[PDB]
Write a protein that binds this DNA or RNA. Structure first.
Lengths: 148, 53, 222, 51, 185, 167
RNA sequence: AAUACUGCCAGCUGGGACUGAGGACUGCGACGUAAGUCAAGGAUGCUGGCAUAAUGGUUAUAUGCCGCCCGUCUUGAAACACGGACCAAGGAGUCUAACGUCUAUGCGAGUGUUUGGGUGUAAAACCCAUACGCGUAAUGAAAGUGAACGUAGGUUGGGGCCUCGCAAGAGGUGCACAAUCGACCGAUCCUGAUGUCUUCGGAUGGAUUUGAGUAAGAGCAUAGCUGUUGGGACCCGAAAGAU
RNA sequence: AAUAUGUAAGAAGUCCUUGUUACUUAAUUGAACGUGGACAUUUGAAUGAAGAGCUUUUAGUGGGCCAUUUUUGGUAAGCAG
């Protein structure tokens, strides 16, 4: 609020926290990103390197639906099965009765392999997958099939 | 100095423990007797100002 | 059956034996003061009888008093004054004479008046103005209990144990002198004896070595 | 609470210094030295006195 | 006037009290200030000084971090004390039986500890069962894993993230960042 | 409420005082004050009067009587700091001053009721003054001119300096 | 032999000044055979006067000494630098969007109800679904690829805990954090395995390379101070320009 | 020369034995990093430490001037540097 600002504490003091010599003006260094190559060059070289220049090729008409690929790691793969069935599926690891995980149903496009699923056979439906994610799923006894 | 301190510590295990490992600075001199046989103190005076040119 | 006499008589017995061992310590330290003084007198007289000259031993201890204020001090003198804990005017401390400490006194010489303190000067100083640095505080000494609490590991059981370790500079001088706070001395009572302080004592001023007249200066400041 | 000076206030001076009662009774600050008749040497005396 | 070797009237720079107006936190400070003063054990001093800590200085401690702490040899029967919150973790699939003394527990963390046979106790329950800190093990969360820390010390040849809204190409990937356009960092 | 409340209320009881370590040691007088010396009163009703010092009372005061036949000062107590001891002395070997003390010089029993809004010598005071004067006069007259000295009054003249005038 | 001078006394003693802080006891000590007393962790005892303008306060004046007229710009202001005849009222770092650090709070690998819907005592409050935002994964220009050899590694330091230990201290565990050597992931470069639509694939291994990475998550939302940017942007002020 | 200035004055160190290397050597040679073992009167000069170290954030400032000493241009300057 206004009563906890320093403007109320600066009542009486002449420059209101801005200095006698400096004489707080409208825009003494410019406006906005003014002089990022001339007189704020040191700021734009120290704190924001990479500001000036055309890197990369232009991608005309970008839609993020094409780049829709949220990633689910293997340690977060077992979050998908709900807790009412999670303990019944972790215990009694059965090849015949394996939990299927519709990873796309929650909205993860690609399964990655950050590691250490328990040694259970688990059915994984994927749009994409990595090599190490499949090898750890193969090591646990599960299978990955692809959906679209 | 490390080799001397290790050797002095090795000998201090046998005899002369607390063998003064640390360096001491130039301590002020203890009291001494200055005899005067053959050393009668010759008196000195300031020299007069001589131009020496 | 109430635990009154069961701890008061034991504490009074402990205080009586602590006072008895301090009494014989002060008796032992007293008797070595006259022997170390009278043999020095007798060594001078024996050398005079033998036709020689007795060089007395150089003084192991200086008492150094800051006489000039905290303004307009160059940084190399200012660091040494802080290292000797002379932070204000008429702040005194004891400095063990070595070659390292001698060139320190040569470097802050226009700001301090140092000399060789006598036993009477030291014991009057620590009785009147001796304060102990215990947990970064100036607790005044005022009994041998806090001397034993903070200097009992070095064998200093009393203020006279502390006095003897100062005048006869022993192996626990660094611990004992750092325990003593810098002496907040007053201005001298009869003045400084000079019209102008900031010349050398040889040049009729106040700073520098006044070798045995630091007793006349500090007995007036105390 | 209040600092009391030693070398006055003899009860504080006797709270410190258990030797102070013996020092006051035996007068050890004003002790007479032993009389002796050692004479300085002539070589020291004439060096001091010459010219 | 004296030679000021340091700054006079300088505050210690540490918290002597929590900045919060939490009455229940101040009760725990009141209990542990008594415990730090009246016990010679330094466990109560550390817990009190950690109770003062702010939200960025009390990071969350996962139950996987509890499990890694109990995985140390000789610390299986120890009680793990978090002065701060405890969150659960889907990375682990078997939390061992233990008693955990934390300020707050998330509902997943309460489920993970209780269903594993263990119990979630508070810091005053800690004070009752262990005033000097018998067989305890204080666990601290990763302080410098915060997203605000990777922007700290930003400069040339530092390997720090610049402060930037939109991460991608055309946003700080040009001169000053690669050798093709002028210079690289 | 015009003023809400003070939450911290200071306690209404008074703490007892600490046991003070001050004993009332007896007063040592000046060396020039011997019982039987003559004093000059420096203040009061009898400024400059020469009086005979008789007894040091236990009040720390001084029982004086310049003889009432001589100078008109009665048997009264004064203060040691408000008198000046002259080097000459009188004889008090044969005078009874044993029954003069603090309660002898008590003024009156004072209450709050009988307070004098607007405004007699005791017969016992006159008679003991007489029997003190009978002993005191018999040695005053044995030396010349001392009776004239006590009846006179001291005064500082022009040019005399009390830092060098021996009294 | 004295005496001067210098120095010492845990020597005595006189006179003066200022201070009386604390408010049961504890403690140290001294004297006394003990009992107790005391100059011993800060003043008590006795006495007198007045009880009101006595003391004190305010105010005016006088006297002694000091004291340049404030604000601002300035290296420097009392300035022969500028503003100010006086008085009353008004009058100048505010709000928003996006954020940064810090702090508080709630929930916490999630978080955020308030776009909307239902309801309501009706712009309030209450309740709610789907998405979406940010976070949980980075890296590359991009195609793409995408984070455990190990008790998530080793070394050094490391609070705290455990064991031994009359007590120092010695071992074991060592969270956070700091430094470093690795390992893994992406990019660059190099060698190129089974294979094969014989031109695709890229296994394995490596580097004076590189990243805003991983290496048992820390974020989201709200609130506040401070700071930034855009806006009139602390207030006021142009010469101008255009319609 | 004086003054000023760099380094060192140890437990992260010293000594002895034997482990790794794709480095090095003629070599089971050295280098680096080690594993074990011995290292109080003072753990290896003096004095001090008044807490030490680290991190964030941001204000103001970025017109200076004077004095001793050294010193430049100038005849000199309450000159300029």
């Amino acid at each position: 609020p206004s009563r906890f600002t320093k403007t109320r504490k600066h009542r009486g003091h002449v420059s209101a926290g801005k200095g006698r010599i400096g004489k707080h003006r409208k825009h003494p260094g410019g406006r906005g990103m003014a002089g990022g190559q001339h007189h704020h060059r040191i700021n734009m070289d120290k704190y924001h390197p990479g500001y000036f220049g055309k890197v990369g090729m232009r991608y005309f008409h970008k839609q993020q639906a094409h780049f829709w690929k949220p990633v689910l790691n293997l340690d977060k793969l077992w979050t998908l099965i709900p807790e009412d069935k999670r303990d019944q599926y972790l215990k009694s690891a059965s090849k015949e009765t394996a939990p299927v995980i519709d990873t796309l149903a929650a909205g993860y496009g690609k399964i990655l392999g950050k590691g250490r699923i328990p040694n259970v056979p688990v059915i994984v439906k994927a749009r994409f997958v990595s090599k190490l994610a499949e090898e750890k799923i193969r090591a646990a006894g599960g299978v990955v099939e692809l959906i679209a | 100095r490390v080799k001397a301190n290790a050797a002095k510590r090795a000998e201090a295990k046998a005899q002369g423990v607390a063998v003064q490992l640390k360096r001491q600075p130039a301590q002020p001199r203890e009291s001494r007797i200055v005899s005067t046989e053959g050393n009668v103190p010759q008196t000195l005076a300031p020299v007069p100002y001589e131009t020496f040119i | 059956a109430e635990q009154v006499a069961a701890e008061r008589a034991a504490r009074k017995a402990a205080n009586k034996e602590k006072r008895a061992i301090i009494l014989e310590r002060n008796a032992a330290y007293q008797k070595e003061y006259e022997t170390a003084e009278r043999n020095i007198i007798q060594a001078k007289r024996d050398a005079k009888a033998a036709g020689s000259y007795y060089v007395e031993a150089q003084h192991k201890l200086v008492f150094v008093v800051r006489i000039k204020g905290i303004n307009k001090i160059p940084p190399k003198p200012r660091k040494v004054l802080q290292l000797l804990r002379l932070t204000r005017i008429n702040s005194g401390t004891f400095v063990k004479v070595t070659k390292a400490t001698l060139e320190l006194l040569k470097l802050i010489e226009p700001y301090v008046a140092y000399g060789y303190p006598s036993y009477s000067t030291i014991r009057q100083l620590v009785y009147k103005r001796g304060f102990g640095k215990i947990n970064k505080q100036r607790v005044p000494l005022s009994d041998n209990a806090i001397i034993e609490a903070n200097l009992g590991k070095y064998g200093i059981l009393s203020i006279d144990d502390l006095i003897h370790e100062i005048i006869t500079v022993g192996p626990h001088f660094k611990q004992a002198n750092n325990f003593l706070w810098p002496f907040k001395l007053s201005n001298p009572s009869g003045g400084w004896g000079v019209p102008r302080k900031f010349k050398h004592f040889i040049q009729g001023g106040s700073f520098g070595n006044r070798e045995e007249f630091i007793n006349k200066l500090v007995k007036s400041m105390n | 609470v209040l600092k009391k000076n030693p070398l006055k206030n003899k009860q504080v001076l006797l709270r410190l210094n258990p030797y102070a009662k013996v020092f006051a009774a035996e007068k050890l600050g004003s002790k007479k030295a032993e009389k002796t008749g050692t004479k300085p040497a002539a070589v020291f005396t004439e060096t001091l006195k010459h010219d | 006037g004296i030679d000021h070797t340091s700054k006079q009237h300088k505050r210690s720079g540490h918290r002597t009290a929590p900045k919060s107006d939490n009455v229940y936190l101040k009760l725990l400070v009141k209990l542990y200030t008594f415990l730090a003063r009246r016990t010679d054990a330094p466990f109560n001093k550390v817990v009190l000084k950690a109770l003062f800590l702010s939200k960025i200085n009390r990071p969350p401690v996962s139950v996987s971090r509890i499990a890694r702490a109990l995985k140390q040899e000789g610390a299986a029967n120890k009680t793990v004390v978090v002065v701060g919150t405890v969150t659960d973790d889907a990375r682990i699939f078997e939390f061992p039986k233990t008693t955990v003394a934390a300020l707050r527990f998330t509902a997943g963390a309460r489920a993970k500890i209780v269903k594993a046979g263990g119990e979630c106790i508070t810091l005053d329950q800690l004070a009752v069962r262990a005033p000097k800190g018998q067989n305890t093990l204080i666990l601290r969360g990763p302080r410098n894993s915060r997203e605000a820390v990777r922007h700290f010390g930003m400069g040339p040849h530092k390997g720090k993230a610049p402060r930037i809204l939109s991460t991608g190409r055309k946003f700080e990937r040009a001169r000053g960042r690669r050798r093709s356009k002028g210079f690289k960092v | 409420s015009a003023q809400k409340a003070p939450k911290w209320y200071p306690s209404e009881d008074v703490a007892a005082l600490k046991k003070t370590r001050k004993a009332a040691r007896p007063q040592k007088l000046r060396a020039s004050l011997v019982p039987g010396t003559v004093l000059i009163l420096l203040a009061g009703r009898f400024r400059g009067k020469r009086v005979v010092y008789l007894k040091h009372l236990e009040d720390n005061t001084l029982l004086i009587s310049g003889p009432f036949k001589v100078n008109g000062v009665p048997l009264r107590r004064v203060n040691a700091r408000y008198v000046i001891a002259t080097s000459t002395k009188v004889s008090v070997e044969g005078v009874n001053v044993e029954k003069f003390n603090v309660e002898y010089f008590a003024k009156e029993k004072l209450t709050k009721k009988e307070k004098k809004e607007a405004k007699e010598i005791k017969a016992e005071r006159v008679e003991d003054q007489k029997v003190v004067d009978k002993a005191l006069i018999a040695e005053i007259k044995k030396t010349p001119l001392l009776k004239q000295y006590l009846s006179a009054s001291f005064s500082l003249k022009n040019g005399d300096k009390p830092h060098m005038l021996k009294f």
